């Protein structure tokens, strides 16, 4: 669903991010690969190193995807089905993995946006990534 409030809470929280958005993707990824190593069996072709121009690169991508999503909030399905197909059908991504990432994403946001990571947003925000994952895994349902 995502109420007219979460969609405001998300948008704001994202807006208050900026160019850093990309840099935050890469960081969220690192957190995940270090925190939940199980998830690494998806990026063998990646040098999950600490400064990997690869991890840093994927971030820029994951970021713009979450943004593409924040922009078409009232309609992410027809937006990410591009990825849904990829993530579902092609890459065969274990769904749980969309939780773990979606977590590090929030832990990351939390560690950079101290002023606005209010519980209100936090919750609002979770739902968002929740709705994103949901869609990214909707091509499983």
């Amino acid at each position: 669903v995502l109420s007219p409030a979460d969609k405001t809470n998300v948008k704001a929280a994202w807006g208050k991010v900026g160019a850093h958005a990309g840099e935050y993707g890469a960081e969220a990824l690192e957190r995940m690969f270090l925190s939940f190593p199980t998830t690494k069996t998806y990026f063998p072709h990646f040098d999950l190193s600490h400064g990997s121009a690869q991890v840093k690169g994927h971030g820029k991508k994951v970021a713009d995807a979450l943004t593409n999503a924040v922009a078409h909030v009232d309609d992410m399905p027809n937006a990410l089905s591009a990825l849904s197909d990829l993530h579902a059908h092609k890459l065969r991504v274990d769904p749980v993995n969309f939780k773990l990432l979606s977590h590090c994403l929030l832990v990351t946001l939390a560690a950079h946006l101290p002023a606005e990571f209010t519980p209100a947003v936090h919750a609002s925000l979770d739902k968002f990534l929740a709705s994103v994952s949901t869609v990214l895994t909707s091509k499983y349902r």
């Binding site: 270090l34 590090c104 950079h112 919750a123």
Partner: protein, 146 residues
Amino acid sequence: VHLTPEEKSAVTALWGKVNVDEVGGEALGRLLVVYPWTQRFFESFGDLSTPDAVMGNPKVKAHGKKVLGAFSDGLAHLDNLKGTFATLSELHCDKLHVDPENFRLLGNVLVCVLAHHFGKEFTPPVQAAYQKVVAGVANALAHKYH
């Protein structure tokens, strides 16, 4: 547990701080505000309507300090985490019937609470460390279901 000694420090040192009195609440609170269904276990705490009602809720902050307390303990008893939480296990399991899942959630928000309060210092590695404790604790609790 395990924790590279390199990992203990990160956990040990970055934990020495912690507004113990506040953080316990920040977790339990955000919990009942982010994952509402958990409120089912705290109707007996007063208005949990809006989050502003949840956060400033004395009954909460009071439970939080203990939740955090139980960690402090588990943190200095990683050697034997299962047992230390034996009572608590019984209390959240065969007595409160909480889903092992909700234990991964409290530790996850807590990690966020930490991710919050300390901000920049909560390096991915330091997280990966807590992420280990949080789980190792979610399991001990889980214990009494098998």
